[PDB]
Amino acid sequence: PRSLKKGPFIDLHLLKKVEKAVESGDKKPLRTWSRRSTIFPNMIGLTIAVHNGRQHVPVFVTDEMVGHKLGEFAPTRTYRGHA
């Protein structure tokens, strides 16, 4: 994981989007490609459509997801079984 004395990583454009959405109450989902950004406590209760390579899968950010990655909440491979 990221070194602590550096801190948690978040993309600037996603940070700006989240700031606008929390300051304006915009319930429309945040379409983003920044899978690598960490979920911050100020995103709690927000719908984010995170890219998975082919589409933007929505994740409802709640309190338990803080510290994890949107990429952790958007699977990239489709597998339903061999037989």
Binding site: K5, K6, G7, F9, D11, L12, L15
Partner: protein, 100 residues
Amino acid sequence: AKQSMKAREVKRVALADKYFAKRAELKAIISDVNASDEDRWNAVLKLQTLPRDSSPSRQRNRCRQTGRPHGFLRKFGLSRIKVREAAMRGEIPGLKKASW
């Protein structure tokens, strides 16, 4: 390799040399122990905003004569095949077949 790939490498080297100083200073202020938290946060954000190709970790060494990205040798700046061809032609000083 493709001319597009070779141009990509040239452009990456150009940008990497252009943005060296800011890159280094931002990394220094981020790494510093005796630095403010707001200062470190702002430095992180600015480093994130610099163009990606300005990072030297993105450039891949290529044979200077063919652009092949594999089999590189930093001493000669060439891939294995061109190294061997020039060595056999005697154009690389001191390099000769080794037995021991």
